[PDB]
Amino acid sequence: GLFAHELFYSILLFDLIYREETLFNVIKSVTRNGRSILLTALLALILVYLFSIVGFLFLKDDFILEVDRLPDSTERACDTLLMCIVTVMNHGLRNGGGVGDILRKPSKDESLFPARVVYDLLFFFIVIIIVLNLIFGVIIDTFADLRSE
Amino acid sequence: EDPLAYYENHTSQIEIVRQDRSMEQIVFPVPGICQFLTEETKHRLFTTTEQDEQGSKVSDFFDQSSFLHNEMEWQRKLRSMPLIYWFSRRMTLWGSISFNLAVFINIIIAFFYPYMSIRPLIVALILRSIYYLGIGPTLNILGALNLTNKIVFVVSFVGNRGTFIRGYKAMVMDMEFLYHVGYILTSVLGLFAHELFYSILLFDLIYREETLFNVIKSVTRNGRSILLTALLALILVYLFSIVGFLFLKDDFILEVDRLPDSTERACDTLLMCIVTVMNHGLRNGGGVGDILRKPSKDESLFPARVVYDLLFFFIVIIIVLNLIFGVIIDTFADLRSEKQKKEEILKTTCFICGLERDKFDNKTVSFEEHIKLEHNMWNYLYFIVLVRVKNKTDYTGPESYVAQMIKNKNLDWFPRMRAMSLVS
Numbered sequence: 291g292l293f294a295h296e297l298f299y300s301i302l303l304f305d306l307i308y309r310e311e312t313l314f315n316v317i318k319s320v321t322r323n324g325r326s327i328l329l330t331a332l333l334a335l336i337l338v339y340l341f342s343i344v345g346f347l348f349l350k351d352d353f354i355l356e357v358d359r360l361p362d363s364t365e366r367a368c369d370t371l372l373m374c375i376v377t378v379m380n381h382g383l384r385n386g387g388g389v390g391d392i393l394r395k396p397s398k399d400e401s402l403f404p405a406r407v408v409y410d411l412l413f414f415f416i417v418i419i420i421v422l423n424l425i426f427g428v429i430i431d432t433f434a435d436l437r438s439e
Numbered sequence: 440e441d442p443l444a445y446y447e448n449h450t451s452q453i454e455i456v457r458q459d460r461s462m463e464q465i466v467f468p469v470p471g472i473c474q475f476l477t478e479e480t481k482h483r484l485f486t487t488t489e490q491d492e493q494g495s496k497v498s499d500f501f502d503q504s505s506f507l508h509n510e511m512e513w514q515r516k517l518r519s520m521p522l523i524y525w526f527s528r529r530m531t532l533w534g535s536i537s538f539n540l541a542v543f544i545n546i547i548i549a550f551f552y553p554y555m556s557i558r559p560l561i562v563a564l565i566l567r568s569i570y571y572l573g574i575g576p577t578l579n580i581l582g583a584l585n586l587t588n589k590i591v592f593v594v595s596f597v598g599n600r601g602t603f604i605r606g607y608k609a610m611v612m613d614m615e616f617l618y619h620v621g622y623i624l625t626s627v628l629g630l631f632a633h634e635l636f637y638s639i640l641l642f643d644l645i646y647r648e649e650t651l652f653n654v655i656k657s658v659t660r661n662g663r664s665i666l667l668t669a670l671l672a673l674i675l676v677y678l679f680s681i682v683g684f685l686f687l688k689d690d691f692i693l694e695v696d697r698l699p700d701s702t703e704r705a706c707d708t709l710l711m712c713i714v715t716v717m718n719h720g721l722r723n724g725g726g727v728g729d730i731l732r733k734p735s736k737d738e739s740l741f742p743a744r745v746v747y748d749l750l751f752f753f754i755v756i757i758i759v760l761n762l763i764f765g766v767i768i769d770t771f772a773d774l775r776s777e778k779q780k781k782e783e784i785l786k787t788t789c790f791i792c793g794l795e796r797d798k799f800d801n802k803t804v805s806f807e808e809h810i811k812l813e814h815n816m817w818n819y820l821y822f823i824v825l826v827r828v829k830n831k832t833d834y835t836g837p838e839s840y841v842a843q844m845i846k847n848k849n850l851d852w853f854p855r856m857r858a859m860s861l862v863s
């Protein structure tokens with residue numbers, strides 16, 4: 291920080307964890323079963339990978355994403371499986387409703403509307419409501435175990 | 440080389456309770472077939488047996504005695520056969536290699552599809568294969584290696600676990616065997632039908648990692664409650680859709696993007712209104728009010744719309760949806776408590792007689808000595824095998840009583856809540 295750049299001093303703010311036992315105890319909930327948390331994250335990644343495979347195979351056209359260009363307004367995001375995986379992981383996981391939010395809004399007259407509905411609801415329930423909540427459940431269980439010990 | 444050492448190592452002792460309710464000590468020579476038993480099976484039996492209503496594991500141990508004996512026989516035969524022994528011993532190696540291969544093939548498929556420690560060294564080899572032969576040839580070679588290794592692994596598995604010993608029907612019955620056959624089928628489909636079929640193999644992480652299986656057990660143990668809560672949510676969504684169709688139909692206008700108007704009505708039929716509510720209100724954080732049309736204040740239905748949206752939010756989004764997470768959280772604690780209780784019992788109680796550690800305090804024999812020498816479940820198993828093997832004519836006094844009790848299915852010859860040393 292002294293000899294290279296002033297913004298390097300920002301890392302020193304982490305000393306609060308060392309100083310305060312309360313914050314350290316709180317973080318111990320995350321750290322004690324961090325392996326469980328990471329395994330749950332890996333399971334989420336695998337499920338996202340399978341969903342991306344399904345979308346690429348059958349729902350490719352619906353993957354249209356808007357973009358802002360520095361000095362068209364839409365780009366296809368499922369031309370390649372890596373692109374589709376990146377889109378799903380980045381947007382569906384972060385969005386409250388899942389992939390259906392980013393995916394194009396389907397008309398009722400369209401034949402694949404039931405398939406799209408099932409796809410979105412399955413993603414929401416399997417990933418957003420169950421898999422993602424398991425990490426928080428693990429953290430709470432670690433809290434309880436630490437308290438009991 | 441010491442005869443006394445050999446005999447001491449090959450001699451065993453047990454304590455039995457006779458018909459007159461008196462305890463006696465039986466010293467017997469360890470049967471030869473006993474040495475072939477596997478440490479893995481011993482650990483599994485020790486850590487997996489479940490207490491009965493009365494709190495004794497002796498019943499289940501005696502029940503599994505026969506499977507243990509058959510396993511010992513097939514262990515002797517397997518050691519007799521040389522080549523299969525080498526494959527059987529290294530079961531973990533095949534599984535680890537198969538898992539690494541699955542991970543690598545899936546990584547390549549994800550990164551390149553559509554196209555056209557020694558782990559770092561293997562990664563370098565794969566990279567060179569991609570650079571020289573190409574993505575497709577590298578994937579083909581990796582898949583062939585995976586299939587060959589999975590065949591080796593299934594052979595090693597059937598050899599080690601001896602599932603067939605119970606019978607072909609039992610072998611098919613075993614769920615782990617079916618999982619391995621499903622893995623083989625998935626590998627074949629990946630190799631021949633389509634490359635994307637290799638994705639399903641990534642589920643092997645759950646099987647490999649016990650921690651991830653424990654995490655998923657929170658979802659699966661009380662999963663019926665979760666499905667019932669989902670059904671309750673569906674019922675409430677159905678009622679809300681009925682209300683919307685009857686009174687708030689016009690507000691159900693949803694924007695639509697069309698492939699080559701900008702809005703469409705979504706509550707012209709009750710099925711469609713249900714689909715709209717279930718698909719959109721549940722996924723949206725606020726609820727159905729988010730998708731529904733924004734009401735102007737001057738409109739007469741604004742007070743009704745406010746109540747509709749807030750009631751949906753509180754009943755469905757806040758309460759019903761949170762009940763599933765509450766169920767998962769409660770299952771976590773239930774599993775933790777069960778595990779802790781089982782561990783405490785296993786650590787602090789005798790397997791056979793069930794006496795606690797504290798009872799042995801300030802005594803000549805420690806609890807460790809009691810479990811090691813006085814009461815050894817493996818010594819009891821050895822005695823049972825001795826009774827089975829020995830000819831009826833040569834039975835001794837105690838052996839005859841134990842054999843008769845075994846035939847009559849009476850488990851009172853085991854000592855329960857009694858130890859000779861504690862008595863005197």
Ligand SMILES: Nc1ncnc2c1ncn2[C@@H]1O[C@H](COP(=O)(O)OP(=O)(O)OP(=O)(O)O)[C@@H](O)[C@H]1O
Nearest residue numbers: 481485788789790791792809810811814815816817
């Ligand atoms: N009745 C019992 N209650 C509690 N623990 C038991 C009981 N019987 C055996 N054990 C434990 O089961 C494990 C298996 O004991 P075992 O006689 O195989 O020990 P070992 O040290 O591997 O053998 P060895 O010294 O004869 O080569 C040991 O931890 C023993 O303490």
Ligand SMILES: [Ca+2]
Nearest residue numbers: 831832833834
């Ligand atoms: Ca005789």
Ligand SMILES: [Zn+2]
Nearest residue numbers: 789791792814
């Ligand atoms: Zn005992």
